[PDB]
Design a protein around this ligand. Sequence first.
Ligand SMILES: O=C(Nc1cncc2ccc(F)cc12)[C@@H]1CCOc2ccc(Cl)cc21
Lengths: 305, 300
Amino acid sequence: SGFRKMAFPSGKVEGCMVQVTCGTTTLNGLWLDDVVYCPRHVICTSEDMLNPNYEDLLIRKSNHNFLVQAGNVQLRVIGHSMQNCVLKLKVDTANPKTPKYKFVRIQPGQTFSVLACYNGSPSGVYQCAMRPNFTIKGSFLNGSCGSVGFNIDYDCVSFCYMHHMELPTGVHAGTDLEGNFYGPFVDRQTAQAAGTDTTITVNVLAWLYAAVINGDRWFLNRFTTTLNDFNLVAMKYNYEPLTQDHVDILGPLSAQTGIAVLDMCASLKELLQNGMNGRTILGSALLEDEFTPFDVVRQCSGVTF
Amino acid sequence: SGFRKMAFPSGKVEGCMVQVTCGTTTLNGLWLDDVVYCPRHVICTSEDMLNPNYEDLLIRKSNHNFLVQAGNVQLRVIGHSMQNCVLKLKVDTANPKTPKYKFVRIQPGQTFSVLACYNGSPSGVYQCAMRPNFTIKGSFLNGSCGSVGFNIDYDCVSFCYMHHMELPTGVHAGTDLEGNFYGPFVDRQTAQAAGTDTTITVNVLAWLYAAVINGDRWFLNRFTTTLNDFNLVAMKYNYEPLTQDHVDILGPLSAQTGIAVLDMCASLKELLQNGMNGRTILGSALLEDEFTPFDVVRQC
Ligand SMILES: O=C(Nc1cncc2ccc(F)cc12)[C@@H]1CCOc2ccc(Cl)cc21
């Protein structure tokens, strides 16, 4: 029993964290095989971050300008190239700790673990979700850039995020491992604002199934609804639309608990229009939306890595 | 900026997780140097559930009765001894991945990361607090016994917990790495009940300072309180008494934010009286008590 926000074991990723220093800037890099990936803004100065020409700044750099440090060992940079907002530094040594990995771009609502690093050293691991507005509500201080988000499928690490910046509201923005930003963000010091966020509906429903699996049933009602009636209520409360794909994905949880997806939707619909009434679900007074249907199944089944 | 429940990176601990099988029972072990630590209840049969005599059951065991598996490699057990509720299995191979480590017994309110394992394989990592009633509100299924709680402060892993059992309310009980249980619990299937839990007051206050550091000030007030008056109010909301030690520990956060501890205590009194009023503090509609003053400073 019990339900916790649980991250993937970070060991396979810790063996890849390195420190990348370019001039006065020091951030983290991801060392996979003979390549070190890091945010391209590591080559920026104070004037350069205001309006940057990264092709021009990178052309002025040489391999010895990048100081890469894996533990207490300096790696020699033998090449540098840029892929979108990520800098790739070819090194002379392949990382012996390179796990089986893939680079995957995730969709809003999907969750992943973040290994927060400072100076190439892992300091914390937390779980989070790609918000519908493409930000992550992370926990990052100065020096955390280059920290990565990942999932684990069997023995394979899927890298899905690299930290680039913090927005004025304290939320975070970054890219996939190909340097493509999540959201309408650019890697420059300029006025940027995250759009109004919405609740990840399929995730709230999965967390309601997790609560039922853990013995919390007070919110269940005799009612069911249509996907049409439910999405009208969802739009009204700044909740993401629930598609037939989401209903299908929630199928195994619906079968395991005996509560049809549209029946759980009628519970959510009532919870939105009426509230908790001083009650809690899984020790929370708010509806949790950072557990996907797969996270719930994985935690309430005991899948290992 | 931002505030999250954050666990320590679990890599140093993953390299120590092994599977321990004794007869039909399979749980997890912690392999440090040439010793594998695991709950002593791994030697229990269906008959040894209510009243096991562990000294008697262990004496009937031989080294070849314990099957230890590190990855896909079976380790050879060359000795077995018991220290309180933990079984120690001497193996013929020192773990090459053994980190710098210590065994530390923690106090209620203290937080730690849990590496949840099944069959010697790490499946998840989460942050926990030792509740005032000496239980942990974990997330554990059958087979998770032997999963450990730890802190990784500067290079060294401090092991503070080993999972042993789940109580009837779904809360969890375990021991330090010397086999001494946290709480009035025994490793028997006998009727055991966790005492009524209370909120870790010093931790709520630390989390309120984290909220102020992150720009949340709506809950602050112009009031201060005496420590005794705060405690008389707090105890009525099932909160732990705040001692002078707690007030002293909150000192650096008080200095950093310019809000005196007893002034933050008056804001906490008001929050217990009024509730949130639809508002949230650090994205939470409840007062969070699983961040210690040391966690808040570390994260901020
Ligand atoms: O606590 C136990 N099991 C489990 C532990 N942690 C989560 C569990 C979750 C589910 C589950 F089925 C078993 C779980 C076992 C078996 C029940 O009785 C006792 C009594 C004393 C001792 Cl030391 C251990 C146990």
